[PDB]
Amino acid sequence: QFVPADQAFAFDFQQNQHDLNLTWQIKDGYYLYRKQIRITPEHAKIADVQLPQGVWHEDEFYGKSEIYRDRLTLPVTINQASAGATLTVTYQGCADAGFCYPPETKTVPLSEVVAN
């Protein structure tokens, strides 16, 4: 069951001005590592991102780790974003079947936002 990474972890975003929501639809039997998520803005300023509380799991890769299953919803606050600004979103997930996908990076185009 080594399906394409984007089928196991369906990533999408929706922005309404200062509010950005990042979503991952996580196929049953797969999970994301909380600690492997990285969000980096380029030409934009965002509020601190608080990763939500997940569940604890144990595997041979990292032993005891906090993971996310089913779906991950992550709100992000854009305080300022110049034209052409982007958000680099990196994450990594594995399959209960016994294998991990490599980290994946998505570039989110941010709509311009005037500060404050």
Q: Which of 9, 31, 68, 94 is catalytic?
A: 94
Q: Which of 6, 12, 19, 61 is catalytic?
A: 61
Q: Which of 33, 68, 91, 101 is catalytic?
A: 33
User: Is residue 11 annotated as part of the catalytic site, yes or no?
Assistant: no
User: Is residue 6 annotated as part of the catalytic site, yes or no?
Assistant: no
User: Is residue 62 annotated as part of the catalytic site, yes or no?
Assistant: yes
User: Is residue 59 annotated as part of the catalytic site, yes or no?
Assistant: yes
Strand, coil or helix: what is 91?
strand
Distance CA 46, CA 11 (A): 20
Terminal-to-terminal C-alpha distance of the chain: 47
The structure was resolved to a resolution in Å of 1.9
Q: Where are the domains of the chain?
A: 1-116
The experimental method is X-ray
Cα distances (Å, whole numbers) of residue 50 to 46, 58, 74, 76, 97: 12, 23, 8, 9, 29
CATH number for the domain formed by residue range(s) 1-116 = 2.60.40.1250
